[PDB]
Symmetry: C2
Subunit: 304 residues, 2 copies
Amino acid sequence: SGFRKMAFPSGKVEGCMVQVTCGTTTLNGLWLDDVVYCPRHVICTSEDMLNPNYEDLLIRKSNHNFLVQAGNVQLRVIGHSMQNCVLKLKVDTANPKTPKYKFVRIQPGQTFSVLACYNGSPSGVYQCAMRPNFTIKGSFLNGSCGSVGFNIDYDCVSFCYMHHMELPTGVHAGTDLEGNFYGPFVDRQTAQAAGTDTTITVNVLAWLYAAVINGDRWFLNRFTTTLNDFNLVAMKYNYEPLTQDHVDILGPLSAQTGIAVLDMCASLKELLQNGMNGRTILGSALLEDEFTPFDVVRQCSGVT
Amino acid sequence: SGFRKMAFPSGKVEGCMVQVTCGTTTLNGLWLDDVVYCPRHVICTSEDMLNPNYEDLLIRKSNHNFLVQAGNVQLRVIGHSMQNCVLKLKVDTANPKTPKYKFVRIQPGQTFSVLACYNGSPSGVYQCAMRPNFTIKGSFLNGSCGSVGFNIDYDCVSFCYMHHMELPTGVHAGTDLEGNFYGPFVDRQTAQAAGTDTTITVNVLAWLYAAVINGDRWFLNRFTTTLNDFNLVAMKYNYEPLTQDHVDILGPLSAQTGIAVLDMCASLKELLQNGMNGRTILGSALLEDEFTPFDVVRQCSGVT
């Protein structure tokens, strides 16, 4: 029993973190096979960041200007290219600790683990969600750029995120591992505002199921609803619309608990309208939206 | 910016997890040098657990009855002893991945990372606190026993917890690595109730400091208080008494923010008396008590 905000074990990713330095900028890189991936803004001064022309800045850079360090051993850079907003540094050594891995672009609402790194050294691991506005709410200080987000399926690390930017509101933007930003963000120090940070409705429902499974049942009511009725209340509370796809995804949790998805919608509807009234659910005073239905099944079933 | 419930990177501990089987019971062990540490209840049937005589049960066990598996390779058990509530299995191979390590007994309020394991395989990592009643609020399914809690200081893993028990209220009890339970708990399936789960006041204050540092300031008031005045309100709200030792510990956060500890006490006092009024602090609707002042300094400074 018990339900915790749980990150993947970080070891397989720890083994891939390196330090990348270009002149006076140091940040983190991901070493997979004989390639190091890092944010292309490694080539920028904070002055450059106001209005960087990456192609022009990059002409001034040779392989020997990228200093790659894995532990306290230097890697030899034998080539470099820009793909979107990431640099790929070809090194002469394949990372011996390269895990099985994929690059995947996640959808809003999808959760992942972040291994926060400074100077190529892991400092911590926490669980995030891609917010519906394509930001994440991370913990990233200066030097944390090139820290990555990942999921693990048995022994395969799916890398979904590389950290690039803090917005002026202190939320976080970054790229997939082909250097494409999530959302409309760019690697430039300019006015960039996030849209509405809506609640990930399907994730809240999953977490309400986790609560029932773990004995927190006080919020279960005598009501049901329909997707259209629920969705009218969801809109009003800046919750993402619930689709039949989401209902389908919640089916196994529905089955295990014997609570119809629409019944749990009606419980969530009353929680939105009536509040928690100073009560908690799984030790939270707000509705948690950073567990996916898959996360809840995983933690409630004990997958490794 | 941003502040997250953050676990230590788990790799160094992943490298120490093994599967221990005695007859029909499988759980997790910790392999350090040529010793495997596991809960002594590995020798019990669920029937045994009602009223186990561990010394008598153990006479029936030989080295060959303990099956230790690291990945998919079997370790040879060359000796076994009971220390308090743990078994120590001497194996013929030193764990090649043994990190620098200490066994430490933590105090209530101290935080640590848990690497939740099943069959010797890491499933996740989360951050806990030793509760003032010497329970933890974990996420532990059947097979999770022998999962460990740890802190890391640069490259030294301090192991503070091994998971043994779920109480009938679904909170968790376990031992230090010399097999001494935290609190009054025993490895027997019997009525064992936790005491009052009080809030770790010094941790809440630390987290209020983290909030101010990260721009969440709405709760800062025009009032101050004294330890005796604050403590009268703390008692009433099932908060742990604040001592001058705690005030001393908060000094650096006091200094960095320029908010006197007693001023922040007066802010916390108003939050207790007045509630959050539907507002959040660092994305929480309740006062978070599972960050130590050291945790807050670490995450706000970027230690690796």
